[PDB]
């Protein structure tokens, strides 16, 4: 299944959807995998999250050129940490329109990230304000509340059974909630549950640091997060 392409791994999840995976050494924790998504929408490609680095992100674009060979219309990144936004410069060098939560763009410089070009804003209920996500096609963007970070966002893919929780969601066999350095411990559980409620039909849950799983990823993550309160 997996396709090794340089130092990255690509996995097809559905007819028009692939997972990208890249790795960074976290001294004291090992080589940490981070996953994002690639979606073909007709004659264009949409990306969710960069790789950890500019070089790795350029490799994602190389893989897309080889395996899909259509223009990348836009990328959306799911918060201002390196695993999700570290390759912003590579996207910009490639001429790709980039989007992030307004709060992610605000936080980007202090987090050592380059901001996206465009800011998403959200209604009180968490759904993206449609004017701020033009031409997103099947990507349905939802802010579930603060959890892994204050700015974490999530993405459903219309026409598929897939929803992407980014670093908010861990798989059903995870022992912990990972790096909580920037987490909102009080609200994490409710935010994980809100993600599930936003995408009730999604049977395949994709996330940053585990392989795709069932919705038990959501229930298990939320149940673990109940212990943070
Ligand atoms: O992260
Ligand atoms: Zn993060
Ligand atoms: Zn992460």
Residue numbers in the entry: 42 to 270
What's written in the study?
As one of the resistance determinants, metallo-β-lactamases (MBLs), including imipenemases (IMPs), Verona integron-encoded metallo-β-lactamases (VIMs), and more recent New Delhi metallo-β-lactamases (NDMs), are Zn(II)-containing enzymes that activate a nucleophilic water to cleave the β-lactam ring, conferring onto bacteria the resistance to the last resort carbapenems and all other bicyclic β-lactams that are currently used. In particular, NDM-1 is one of the most widespread and threatening MBLs that binds and hydrolyzes almost all β-lactam antibiotics with Zn(II) as a cofactor. Moreover, the active site of NDM-1 is located in a shallow groove encompassed by several loops with Zn(II) coordinating residues, which confers conformational flexibility of these residues for efficient substrate binding and catalysis turnover.
No significant overall conformational changes were observed between the Bi-bound and Zn-bound NDM-1 (rmsd of 0.18 Å over all Ca), while only subtle conformational changes were observed at the active site.
